[PDB]
Symmetry: D2
């Protein structure tokens, strides 16, 4: 595969519907060796089953709200992977109250704090912690959403965290590029996942996109995963700091 000889760490696999899950499959189909992290014990065993299917016995607990957790995970990771080639950051979070109705009324200081910390900061946090274990030709990838670029109803403060994140991709890419590390983001169209269910009228959001999207269908985790495998492979060597839209063309069309 085009990822043969690559060791990539994959975050965010909550279930078989997760973008991370679809991403690991594409990467594994492409010859990459994978390592998975699980946020907690509620998720532990599940992630272990998926690791096994993708031929990996590296499943480490990691909660990006904690520096020491990121730190410990990388330590256990180095035991098998002293040096690796990148990671996939598929982690996003905002307190439930943050996501519905008028943004100005919903947003609070803490919610803003948590949303930016978990969705934006965690990306660089993970980079700091493993920066020295990365081989040249490494690539990091995170997942963003159009709410970063446009004011989308109910997405509220998550739109700001995503905007922060995209700026992170640029700052990381400019800082880590000179040492052989690329950093990019896939701006994915809406996909029904556990987290998606936290946004009001997601079902109508999906149907809308399916209708107004040039390709005339919503994207799949297979679609996203394929772009992800590419962005983390040497095939995308000339791309860094880029936010690739994998939404079928939705954001470029208008009043369809």
């Amino acid at each position: 595969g085009f990822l043969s000889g690559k060791r990539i760490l994959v975050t965010g696999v909550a279930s078989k519907l997760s973008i991370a899950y679809g991403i690991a499959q594409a990467m594994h189909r492409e010859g990459a060796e994978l390592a998975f992290t699980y946020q907690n014990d509620k998720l532990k065993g599940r992630v272990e089953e998926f690791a096994a299917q993708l031929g990996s016995d590296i499943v480490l607990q990691c909660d990006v709200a904690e520096d020491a957790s990121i730190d410990t995970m990388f330590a256990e990771l180095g035991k098998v992977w002293p040096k690796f080639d990148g990671f996939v950051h598929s982690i996003g979070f905002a307190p439930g109250d943050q996501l519905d109705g008028d943004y100005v009324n919903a947003v609070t200081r803490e919610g803003f704090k948590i949303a930016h910390d978990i969705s934006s900061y965690s990306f660089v946090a993970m980079a700091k912690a493993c920066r020295s274990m990365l081989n040249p030709g490494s690539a990091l990838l995170t997942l963003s959403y159009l709410g970063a670029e446009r004011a989308i109803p109910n997405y509220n403060v998550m739109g700001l965290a995503k905007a922060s994140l995209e700026a992170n991709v640029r700052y990381m890419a400019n800082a880590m590029g000179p040492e052989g590390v690329r950093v990019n983001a896939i701006s994915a169209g809406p996909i029904r996942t556990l987290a998606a269910s936290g946004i009001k009228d997601f079902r109508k959001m999906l149907a809308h996109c399916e209708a107004v999207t040039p390709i005339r269908r919503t994207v799949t985790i297979e679609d996203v995963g394929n772009s992800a495998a590419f962005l983390c492979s040497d095939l995308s060597a000339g791309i860094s700091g880029e936010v690739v839209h994998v939404d079928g063309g939705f954001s470029i069309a208008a009043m369809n």
Copy 2:
């Protein structure tokens, strides 16, 4: 002038070089009634002097890091301006350690938290706090920098904070527009100010910019203040959720 009948609240006047200062002067020259806030005790009397000069005797304290301070300032404001027509948010802050050398190495969880809290959240926190005192036709304004859109050396996490901020403008503009409130931002080119001194080799920025800028000069606080008065007056009724670049054209040129 074109702001006659407008009562505007101006924040961030730390000195006669402050962008907020240059903005207050233009808004005063165009007929507006102003109210000033000062962050702390160190700045108080300085702000009172300028206020007096701009014919205002409404100088209230406000530390945007504290909700209670934001809430009290508006209660105090209500006593004189039960209803007013918008405010200028000219506040920014990132801990000193954050602003120099490699981004990834420089950034920390608290620096990120703080940079975002003071540079981005505070904007919406203020809007929430006075949402009901705003008259139809009200305009809210904030100041951003190109760091939001491009990875600029040393600007580091402040670029991420601005990215979040510009997103905020869009989400606030979308949320408040329905009740008669516009929200926009001026993306100002570099200007030597108190806070400007906190970035490495700023002197070279200013000169680099002066040379590669289409208008061939760096912008002024007079420049920025005229655009801000415009953006907080009825002259800009057709504009909302916009980040206008008052950088003399610097960002649209390349390899000049």
Copy 3:
């Protein structure tokens, strides 16, 4: 007013609904001296009436499809305004066949040629033709549409023409800035005008926009003219090579 002492040349007044008309009115309300051009004989007397009303008796013919017409208009202009302070380019055209149904099927080599020639080239052709009559502090302005940035149904090749136009603003701003000339564009939201009637289901555009627009209303020629007066006055000294959106916020929102 803020344009007192400014002599501006206004193009594209086809009627009292014309954006150029609403612009001329604001520029006149702010103290500017205007000069008007009319495309042909059919429009001549109409333009003379408005001119007279806006206190001007300088009405010259100008078909931007002909260099010689552009050259003669300026020679005639020189006789009264040897030097002036900029002009408003409010001219757009694509053959009728170009504007409806599927883009690819609708577009032809000549329609493309024409749409670009009249909607984009003409802007720089006029600047070339008067480059030496422009005083320092001069401003050039043009009008664009969101079609440049997003694929909008039926707008077809005109969107490509606008894309070329917005690029022109940037290249002209960069080239002329050094001699004291700023060049910008207003990206106006839909407004019912003579040319507006040439697009399919425009009535539904206007209503769709009125509903999904942050300010909850479509912009007016008054709205656009105040932003244009601002952009052609010294109030916008810090702005050049910029495409300001006077669409009430429509483009920054999504799935409203």
Copy 4:
């Protein structure tokens, strides 16, 4: 390869340094069947040698300035490829005089005409002519440059043609998407090619980029070709109307 079972037509191979050449290699390495066009007889035999190496005996003359030439080529193409899966548009042109010094002085009506016609229109022209021979899952790709987004010295009118083109990708993608056709663009960093030699100080342009680019090197046709193979493969199914930057990160960095 990931392009196995794909028949792609490749335009623009002038020499072994051509972006098209590097693109065909990547596509051929990935299992795709290719067909090549040559603009003229000066180029004919050369393109035939490259076709042979890439295992293709389909080399058709095509000059995109002529509808009948595009038309005839597709007719001869259908003889072997009744239906195919897409094409690579790597064609750009502007009269020599257009490319040096002050844009406003260099640009002329004809130069603008030719530059837009050959660099922008030809893309859709080719799409019109073959629209019905495309299988579902087809993808078209064109090559753009940052001069479309920023005013780059000496690029002059080519920057406008590229802006027109990028708008074309969006219009094409929105029109052809519903029938199973994606349209995208690679915005390539500077690469020394025959055409490149038409831009003043290209050598200094290259060195600059190599220094200020996050990856710290200029891109290669291998880099571009790899992204091209991906954008024309089912791997990029969720991407359409996108302008992917393959420039190492140059456009996202600032004042490096």
